[PDB]
Amino acid sequence: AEVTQLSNGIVVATEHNPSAHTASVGVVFGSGAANENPYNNGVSNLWKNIFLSKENSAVAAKEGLALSSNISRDFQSYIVSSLPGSTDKSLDFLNQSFIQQKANLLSSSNFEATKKSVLKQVQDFEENDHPNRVLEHLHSTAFQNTPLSLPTRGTLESLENLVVADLESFANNHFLNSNAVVVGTGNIKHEDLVNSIESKNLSLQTGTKPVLKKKAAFLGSEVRLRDDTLPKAWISLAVEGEPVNSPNYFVAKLAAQIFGSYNAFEPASRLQGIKLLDNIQEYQLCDNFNHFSLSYKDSGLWGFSTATRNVTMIDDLIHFTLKQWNRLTISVTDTEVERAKSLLKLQLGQLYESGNPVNDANLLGAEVLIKGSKLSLGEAFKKIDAITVKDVKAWAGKRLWDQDIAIAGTGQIEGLLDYMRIRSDMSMMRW
């Protein structure tokens, strides 16, 4: 399905969907918040809001175009959406506003206003979005003193000292042909997109991105942000996981699907075939939880997140969930593996067939920027169907059984026990 060409230093990747009603083109760079430093943290967040500023969007609206941008730890993207008969109109807008003529966007009275608004978005996030700011501190403590520990939005102190010359420095080092992929998804054709870049002579700078010194290194630790005025307790807990291109990439995702997610107020979520629900529903230990498997270029995280109002029984919630992780290493049934196989395929099928061309562009560019190509959905289903119980036991034995953990929490967390008490629950003396 997907086609990738290297006509020049830039790479062109596409995904033709003839039964769609929109098209999207854009550029994805192989740099994110992991390519900054504590003192300029949030520069890549400021660049996203410059692309989506009022003056830039007014020009695109008059032509019937919509702008989208996303910042991650390993990549950032700038997308333009349009009707199927106006693909060359979007390529021209991307060229004249981003690839070249970037000084008018970076003008004064536009940098100042955009900077003032981003400072407000960051302050609100740090005071209202408790479940998401806890997951950001989990990265901060698991990979402390490392590129992989910097928040994707920046901090109030990095942004407050950012100045006029700081944004131009970053784009020189990172917005280059060797660091970029041009992506077209929706009702577009590979031949029609390549024939348009070769005519307009589109090209970025011809440098090379700097090479970092350190690498990602997991360290067992914890950070606690207690706040007795909040009504709940939010907690995140994880061990070291798998990076992308790991052989055990789908085993770790299947292992997270065995315990899944839960919502106390949804009647159908209380009937799921998860044995953990039998210990936590009698006394209402939590309101919701979800298990994840995050994968980056160098490392990853594997764990779960919870929000609860039962502040006097937090230890029971942590004790019971970790004792269920113990069964992956020693005793996990065939039915649990077969059920998780069917729910992982459904979950992946929804993510890669959402029908939104903007979502597909982000997933396509990020995959090509690392692996060089993109694995087919049918090929992924074959690998998922081949996992056995012996593969789960081997994986969990080396990653989960008696291993260090990282913990982050906020709210009413007086009932969360010490590190060593929680750490000692990662195995058991009975086996």
Added chain:
Amino acid sequence: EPEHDERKRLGLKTVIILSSLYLLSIWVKKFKWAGIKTRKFVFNPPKPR
């Protein structure tokens, strides 16, 4: 004191075993207390409500 000879021999095994247990206990205690001993607190005064 007809037990004098055997008492002194048994006291040599007690002291050696109990001295090595006492030293091995100091290390184990310090290993379990490492997280608490090296712990850092910071204070950012909250803004008025």
